Amino acid sequence: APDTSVSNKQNFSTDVIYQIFTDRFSDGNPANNPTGAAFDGSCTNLRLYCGGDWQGIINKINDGYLTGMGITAIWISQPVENIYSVINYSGVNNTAYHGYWARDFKKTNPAYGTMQDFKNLIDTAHAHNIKVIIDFAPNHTSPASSDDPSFAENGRLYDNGNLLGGYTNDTQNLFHHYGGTDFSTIENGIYKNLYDLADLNHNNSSVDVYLKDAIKMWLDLGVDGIRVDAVKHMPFGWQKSFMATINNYKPVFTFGEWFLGVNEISPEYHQFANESGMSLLDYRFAQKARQVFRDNTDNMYGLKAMLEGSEVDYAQVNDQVTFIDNHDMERFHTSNGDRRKLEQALAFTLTSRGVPAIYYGSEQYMSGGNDPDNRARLPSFSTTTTAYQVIQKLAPLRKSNPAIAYGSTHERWINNDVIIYERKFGNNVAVVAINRNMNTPASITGLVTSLPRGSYNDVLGGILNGNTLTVGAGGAASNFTLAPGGTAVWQYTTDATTPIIGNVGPMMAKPGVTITIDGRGFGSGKGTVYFGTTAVTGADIVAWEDTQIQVKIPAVPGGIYDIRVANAAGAASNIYDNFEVLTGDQVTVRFVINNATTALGQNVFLTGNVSELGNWDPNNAIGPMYNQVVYQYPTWYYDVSVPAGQTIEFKFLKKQGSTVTWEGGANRTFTTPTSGTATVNVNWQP
Ligand SMILES: [Ca+2]
Ligand SMILES: [Ca+2]
């Protein structure tokens, strides 16, 4: 089926996501509304339920509000049953309207609808070529106090109505009992509770298996994507076995949220996007777009440097979800902000690399500060705002122009207030010119592009004051004046003759799993897929057409491989790197080592004989391990995704700078479980 099909659950670069807080969008069925203290139909107390549900989203797909805009994916609130308590936090009452306080991950939140309403949403969205992404928040259940069993629902977890346990008198240790995080370290933020939310213990086998069974159920109901909440607050090792469960079962696009503040660049963030199996909400893009287009705290050179730098730092930049605001940020549009600023930032996001996500109500110019003021009910479903027309004209180019869905980003002209960039994929081109200065015209001279000669009409139709571009010989544009606030988009599409790979999903899975390779120029006849130097042909290629190949991963050893495609004529594509073949199914094992004293700056790591442990290479060892919360120095510990049902060999080592000190003695051995978790508790061998 083509890369642009609604059935492509693995890659979303050709999509535009609309992020919906279910409760704040449309109340299509008032009979399922919470009653009493939990409900506010006027939606003026924004911490209560206002009544929005899945029938409301179905109505807005059916009547053309969402499809008229060109939206091809909706991101909705976590669908699972939440606690029913109205919690009074210092006078103000609070409900689970946001979906984040789960009590049963196998049932629906009845305020949103029944299981049949969820199914009708999937089917209605798919029948209108809209993919459905759900939030999933496996880090916690709900607010709880072990000291006060009567507070809220005591964080209790049910499995399809059967109570597994609560936070008070947690004899099975389903939860962590280490106190609340102060966010001082990543370790601290993982094993301690976020605020008062009962922290799930993923090293408990019942919890591990339950959460994995639960995500499979939602995959079985037809969801096309998962946004995982709080990825910075769960063990990386556990989340990698969780991604392995999804990808080895029914791979769908998965991305997490790891917040970054203005000008913050975090190596751990980029390492998570590059090695976890899921991509991220691109905060780096979002914060810089807001500094240049909203707050005027940086100029176009800052924008250029983020675009150029992120192309390198993210191994798969076409998988990052971009946005200009969302549920954790003040709305982009302010009371005294010019509406053109929002209109340009939306144009920039819709034509840039990644997967664009538009927060509900952007097209209606909603203003609002932080939580909960950025979650007001949508005021209007007017389909004629300039913001609605901008998304309506640009969001289709993601399906029609592969340079926008997949291409490289190249700055063609710039100064403090103007950027003209080009997106290029094969011979498909899109060129975007943005003047953020609302008062001054920009004289453009010397612009050169990859456009064939012609008179290109602005895809926006002049609504943001764009103009026609005349391109002469050799891609040289005739000189022009870009209007104050001007934004224009010019494009050219044609066939690719050469194979070009634009995206691959999933990027981590065991031998036997079918992966999806999207791009252009693959041709109609079945050709060859290379995993490193291993060629895959014939029956292992499940489908081949010009924009998409589906192929089974060969039985090669675990490790990182480059993907390359050769069409039937033997012409080969660009290399798509960093694909991880797993040794097999994954389980998370906690490795604990005692008596490992270290010097300043010296940490303990783990390595062993499978790719998941770095195949004995100190530079790819797992760690640095932890030593403060669950166990304390000189005991170190870490949760690691390792192949299931196998005897692995390993050794611990200390690293400080370039110096590696290996444990002495024989290599350690351990036979991993087939499912669930296990703990290895050992003593440093001198
Ligand atoms: Ca309702
Ligand atoms: Ca946690």
UniProtKB/Swiss-Prot annotation:
GO biological process, one term: carbohydrate metabolic process
Major enzyme class: transferase
Region (B): 139-202
Pfam families, sorted: Alpha-amylase, Alpha-amylase_C, CBM_20, TIG
GO molecular function: alpha-amylase activity; cyclomaltodextrin glucanotransferase activity; metal ion binding; starch binding
InterPro entries assigned: A-amylase/branching_C, A-amylase_C, Alpha_amylase, Carb-bd-like_fold, CBM20, Glyco_hydro_13_cat_dom, Glyco_hydro_b, Glycoside_hydrolase_SF
Subunit structure: Monomer.
Protein name in UniProt: Cyclomaltodextrin glucanotransferase
Organism: Bacillus sp. (strain 1011)
